[PDB]
Amino acid sequence: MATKKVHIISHSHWDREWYMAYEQHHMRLINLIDDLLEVFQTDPDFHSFHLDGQTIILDDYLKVRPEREPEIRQAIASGKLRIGPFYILQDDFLTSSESNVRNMLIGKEDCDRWGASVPLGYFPDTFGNMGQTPQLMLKAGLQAAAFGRGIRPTGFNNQVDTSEKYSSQFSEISWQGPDNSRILGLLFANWYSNGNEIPTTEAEARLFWDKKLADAERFASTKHLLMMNGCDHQPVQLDVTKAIALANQLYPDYEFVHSCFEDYLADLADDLPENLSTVQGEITSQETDGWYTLANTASARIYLKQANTRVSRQLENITEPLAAMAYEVTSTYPHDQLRYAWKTLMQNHPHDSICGCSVDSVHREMMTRFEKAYEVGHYLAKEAAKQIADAIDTRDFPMDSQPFVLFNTSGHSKTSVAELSLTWKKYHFGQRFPKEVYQEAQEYLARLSQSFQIIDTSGQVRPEAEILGTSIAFDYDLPKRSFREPYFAIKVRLRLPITLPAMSWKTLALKLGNETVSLYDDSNQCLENGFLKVMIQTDGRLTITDKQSGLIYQDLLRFEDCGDIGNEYISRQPNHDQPFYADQGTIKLNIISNTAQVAELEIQQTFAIPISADKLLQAEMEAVIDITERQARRSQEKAELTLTTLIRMEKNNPRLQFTTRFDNQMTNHRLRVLFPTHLKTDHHLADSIFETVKRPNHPDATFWKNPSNPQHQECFVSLFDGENGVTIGNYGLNEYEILPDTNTIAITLLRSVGEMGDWGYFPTPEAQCLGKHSLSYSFESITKQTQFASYWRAQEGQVPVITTQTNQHEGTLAAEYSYLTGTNDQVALTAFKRRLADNALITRSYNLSNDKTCDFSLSLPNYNAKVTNLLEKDSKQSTPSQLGKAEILTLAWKKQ
Amino acid sequence: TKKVHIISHSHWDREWYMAYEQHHMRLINLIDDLLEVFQTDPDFHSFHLDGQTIILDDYLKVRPEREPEIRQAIASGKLRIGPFYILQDDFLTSSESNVRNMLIGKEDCDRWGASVPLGYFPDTFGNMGQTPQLMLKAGLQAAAFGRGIRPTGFNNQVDTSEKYSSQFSEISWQGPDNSRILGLLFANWYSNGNEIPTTEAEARLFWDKKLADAERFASTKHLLMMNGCDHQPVQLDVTKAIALANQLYPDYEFVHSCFEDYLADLADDLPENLSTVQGEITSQETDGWYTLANTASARIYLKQANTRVSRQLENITEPLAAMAYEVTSTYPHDQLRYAWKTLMQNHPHDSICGCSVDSVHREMMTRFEKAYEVGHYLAKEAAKQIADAIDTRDFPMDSQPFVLFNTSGHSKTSVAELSLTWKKYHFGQRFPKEVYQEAQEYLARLSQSFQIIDTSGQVRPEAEILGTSIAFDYDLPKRSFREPYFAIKVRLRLPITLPAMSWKTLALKLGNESETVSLYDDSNQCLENGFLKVMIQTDGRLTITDKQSGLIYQDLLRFEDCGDIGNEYISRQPNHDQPFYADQGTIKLNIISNTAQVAELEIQQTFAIPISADKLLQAEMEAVIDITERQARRSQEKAELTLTTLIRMEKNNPRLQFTTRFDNQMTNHRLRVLFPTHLKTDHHLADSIFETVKRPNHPDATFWKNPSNPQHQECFVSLFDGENGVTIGNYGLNEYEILPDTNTIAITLLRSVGEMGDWGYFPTPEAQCLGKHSLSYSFESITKQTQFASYWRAQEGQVPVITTQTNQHEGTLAAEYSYLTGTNDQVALTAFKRRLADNALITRSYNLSNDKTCDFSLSLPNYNAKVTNLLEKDSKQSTPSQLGKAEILTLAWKKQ
Ligand SMILES: O[C@H]1[C@H]2[C@H](O)CCCN2C[C@H]1O
Ligand SMILES: O[C@H]1[C@H]2[C@H](O)CCCN2C[C@H]1O
Ligand SMILES: [Zn+2]
Ligand SMILES: [Zn+2]
């Protein structure tokens, strides 16, 4: 008799931490799971509960109630708890590429431990969805994803629009990625609360269902209607069975059933039509007014994004590759510790956490977690490096010298001027008064008449090296098999120009021995190497001439300070807000260093800016006035802000490095650095999750009302006209904007606000980011031939050369070694790790281009590869010789 | 003829000179090595795991799949665990904390299936006088410890004059209640047997000394060789070393042993000839430089935080949940265990002492916040659960009921500071601005005055309405979605006396709108109530007259700033250091409030102090110069420091409250507040662990070389001449000193230093405690008749009145109820909780006097008591009617 099937999926959308401290949310999670296990006993008809796609919920429950593991396990075995397949619900754009994979890796592992998994990608609330979601789902064994933002459902009764890229006829779509992967897209057309708090009395039930059924039927491509029975931190509906029974009694034409996503997916498999509308690539709310995309979360609490970048690089690009190589020597690899580090890092990856859009105490807690994960990574990295160095045959170095090993742990050649600190001698305390040992060390340094030099395996001096100084520093060793050993160390501080092949080490040595145009021209205020001529203008901005293309760019590196009367989600400049520019202040130049190899120049600007917003903003936040209606302005009172930017140019390096430093003592404002390119193109390229995504330089004027168009980036953003362009790299600076009049790249360096935003008034004075800041970003001028290299440089430039010391000894390893070969500028390396099951060396690479294929020729000598999925499960598929556009390739290498 | 017990161990400081995770990873290596050596060397007897069960939790957080292996190793005796959870600082943790360490430790040990029957205090900086009672009433007949007892040979005659010298390495330790335990002194430190050699020449050199070192103090033929040290790796070849020792010494029987076997052998052979040590062991008979007592003022913010969480759990969360159980039949055991483990992760000595590096203490702050929020959530729940079940129908429907709780063990008299929600204007589906405008209109229209009423509808005239406002707030219902609203808030102060562990229900209502002499006289500059006349001098110091005894104290409340060129363990005032005094600067008075019930007055002093230490300090720290040799001095450059002290006097309160506020921007200094008493007495009384310990006002002139004598306190310190005295209360201000020439009580408010100290140079810039501070402390003038009341006042004053609102409803509970009776001034209440096994209500009380017995009449209506030990296990013993001197009594109450 019934022609519709109404699926009721009981769920709770459980943001780990948000408007309250984690523990406040945590204790309410205990109540939820408690109510669930109790209801599973009292009401046998209660079908299942969907645990928000995140396995961390189970961990968080057991941390309080570990003795309830068997009851949890049984509930999962019978299907009453529906778990996974992710560990946390991330922000896509603000976590690293690898982090998006490791969320699935760890989630799957947790699911395997429990014995079940929901086969649905879960992005119910994500502030924009990465373009690579289809490939990431498929290659993690998932055929569908559910999401809530950025697609406007148009009626079935209205004719479709082909001009509108981000509209869909039905609540079900076909999502295609840049690599041509396709998945089922499941859109919460009526939000994930459409079936929240179903009534149990007739009159209320009728009013509820008359609306809800019509709202669902309007968008559904099939007879299966999706009713989501929950909301944010919603307690479980304990009388849902009775509510379903009433619904069935009132609407004989509708089959109301307590359901789960797996069953809903299976019913859609039978009845889904062939005319589903297609969505292409990233979904970032392009076709909206642009005021509620929440993209400004990218610049909320930038210090968080910086910490996240620090730890992500540490785990992905230092610790894992080092431990991956050390395995060849130790036959062991720290899986448990790495899992502990990744879990700790990813507790910062739920969207309200990483987005910086929670309360003050939440973000203070994240900082602790960042520190904890980093320390673990850092311990493991130092261990791996010593293990490798200890196995190197270092006997080409005379007894008078102190060997040390440098590592490039990135996937392309690394050319830099390495900044090093080496221990030359150790003066052990033993049983003596430390002051007397200190005096010995001082006396040694005073007797010293020789100069330090660096030598290679063939006894040749590296004349390019520069010794900066010697000093005495307390230090200590912590042996594996005995007590701590304190000592005063003679330390030699030096810089070393070096080019290290991809995934390589080279051993050199420090010794005593006997013992070119500077990059900066002092009379001309000019930095110049083989690639660039950088003139420092009297106002402090830069005129950069590319010495190979010939193109001149004036007025680069402009600092802009604007009011911000918004919140942690959304930036708003006040009415008739005029920018303050640092170049209009007082400018001082300072040479930090200047040689033929490296020059470091400081540009200091002092300019007065408003100290805060005026007294009106406080009244406007307290009353929860929408940010678009606010009449508050910047205060009339001003204070001097001093910006120092250190410019590092290196001799053989096309990438120009900047570090901008200041003490922020001002509230409700935003600081950006600007690079006007004036390049002739209507699009730009941005570093996204496993892709260089093409975006228009103008937002869509049909829909867009926000004067601003902030966008997300990982390591770089770029403009290219077909022959020439500019790549701006960053480190934890995830918000950029393109200013279309001039094609200016604007990088957000600081955003200070005083409140969370969203549903209420939640004061967050710490969101003002008072205190010292230091932001790193770079400029590179590009041609067709260097475009891709500029991309990997911005990526791998985030990772320092690693250094470790060891003595003269026999070893099984060569002094100079490349772990891999066959690198392509167009192929990025993001993972170099080992697999838990059998210790296979897992690599992951992706095509830096969305347009065209390239040759793939990655090779690890002594190893054979086979293709795996993102979760490191072998597939039958054979190793490709080429990457498809936007292909992500994961490989397991086994020692031959 | 001699038996040498080799106990392998590692002294594992959870976090110290490195970040926790750095130590954590090395712990994984320790346990890995142990499990491995259990498999490869069958002769390896056991390993003593530093007396702390947290080690096992920490290991399993990284390697959870190794739980079976751990359990097997524990079952066979190869791992010796517990009996504590952590190794605390005795003095710097709460009284209850010292019990809970054993409670949780026991629970952990019971779960694992074995326990070492030895209290473990290997490195504690001072041992609490109540150690024997605490050990016996926890099922322990012995404690091991390392500090504060000087062993004199059996060759030298035993000196009766020296309280803290022992003839042997074994003592009888006698508590203030006459409890005796076996004291096991590490006479040669817990490293005496570290790194035993495996070669003949080294072994003989080693054992000739070590055996003679032990034989010199051993009362029996049993020699204690502790095979380990701080963070010592396990000695993998110890079996070999023990076999070599046996081949070399036919006269000696070297065995790989454990503490249990060692104690069992001791019980046989111990002579009745052992020295007795009485009370606390704090290194009273040393030079006084290496007591490490100044750990009490290292990073005072930590101690404040610890106090906040300690009061939250002990005196708010548990007392409310214990009562709420009557209604819900449930009590949050798991949540509380989680709260306590989190809190106690901050209780290892190097943690709470603030003698670690900066990152360790940043992590502690997160842990404090986490523990606090769990407790705070549970308290608000319990209060709500109770209030929701009170019969509140006696109040009119146009009124707003609220319940006030006193959760302390005595009568609480204060002026409660309250903020009540009068009306809720819910957001519903409207724009917040419209709803806000409604709330503003209500207040604009409002013509009546707010009043407080009791059950009989009678107005409380002493209540003062301070003001009304609009504030965003929200409710989080148990069974539905969040509910935002704008609340009309009434801010008011309410004088009230609540009996011990009781509640009272009042109500807020509107109604129609004397004869009051204000507490402060603006002409006299005088604060005056029934108890004290407080004259503020022109220099800002205080002249307080006790209106009862007639005694006058001049020049009270002096602020003294001194140099500190020491470290986190030890304070050192530079050579010829001349203190700067706030009264010698610029003084300002500001009235904050002044009524018949309450007066709040602010004394502001602005004075110039040195901004730092001179440049020589840096050199001295770097070279690791001992603090007693440092020639560093305060800098010549000074800055202005502004202290604001808020004095609060209440009409019926004899205790005068102070809150000193300032922004610390100067380094290497100490700030104290002094109370000169000039009382004729040679001893003082300090709040210690379950005791009011008697201490001399003078350090021991025979031994003491340190110009200072800093001591530890919990909630108060007091001077009494036999008829009159002074009690100074504090909140997290755990360091005090008595200045003997004037009998001045000095409370340390700030101690700022730049390094950790101990075995090397570890810079700790955050130990300078830069930023905003707020320190709370109290003054009471006492007589014989009010002495003990001042102690529980200072204890219970740390705990606020709890407030919770509820609507008009029927209910099982009375509107006004006392949960206990039979309170006595001499009897403190420290625990009011429930017991896991059967939800029996657990009370703990102690005698506030070490001298005299007192009547004990504690009674819980509807309940019957039986005596338990500290760990809540029933004994056959019957409920005493008197408390013995310094007795701690734990009771379990069941409903009748
Ligand atoms: O994550 C929370 C919130 C985001 O912070 C902003 C948009 C709405 N979301 C609902 C909550 O789950
Ligand atoms: O706790 C460490 C340290 C203390 O912090 C101070 C002196 C004794 N040391 C032993 C170590 O374990
Ligand atoms: Zn969310
Ligand atoms: Zn220690």
Residue numbers in the entry:
A (entry chain A): 1 to 515, 521 to 901
B (entry chain B): 3 to 515, 519 to 901
Share the article's original sentences.
Streptococcus pyogenes M1 GAS SF370 ORF Spy1604 encodes a putative GH38 α-mannosidase. We have shown that The S. pyogenes ORF spy1604 encodes an α−1,3 mannosidase that is active on disaccharides, some aryl glycosides and can also effectively deglycosylate human N-glycans in vitro. This, coupled to the presence of a gene encoding an N-acetyl glucosaminidase (Spy1600) on the operon (an enzyme known to break β−linked N-acetylglucosaminides) would suggest a role, in vivo, in the utilization of human glycan-derived carbohydrates as a nutrient source. Comparison of SpGH38 with Drosophila Golgi α−mannosidase II suggests a conserved domain architecture and catalytic centre in which diversification in the “leaving group” subsites accounts for the subtly different specificity.
Here we report, what we believe to be, the first structure of a bacterial α−mannosidase from the human pathogen S. pyogenes bound to the therapeutically important inhibitor swainsonine. The natural product swainsonine is known to be a versatile glycosidase inhibitor having previously been used to study the active center of the Drosophila enzyme. In addition to the favorable electrostatic interactions discussed previously, the position of F127 is conserved across α-mannosidase II active centers. Additionally, swainsonine is stabilized through stacking interactions of W18 with the five-membered ring, suggesting that the two aromatic residues contribute to positioning mannose into the correct orientation in the −1 subsite. Other conserved active centre residues, D125 and D232 are in equivalent positions to the catalytic nucleophile and general acid/base, respectively, of dGMII. As with the Drosophila enzyme, it is likely that R149 will encourage D125 to be ionized (as required for a nucleophile). The hydrogen-bond from Y192 to D125 may also stabilize the ionized form of D125. D232 will likely be neutral due to negative charge repulsion from D125, as expected for the acid/base. The structure of SpGH38 is consistent with previous proposals (notably) concerning the chemical basis for catalysis with net retention of anomeric configuration in this family.
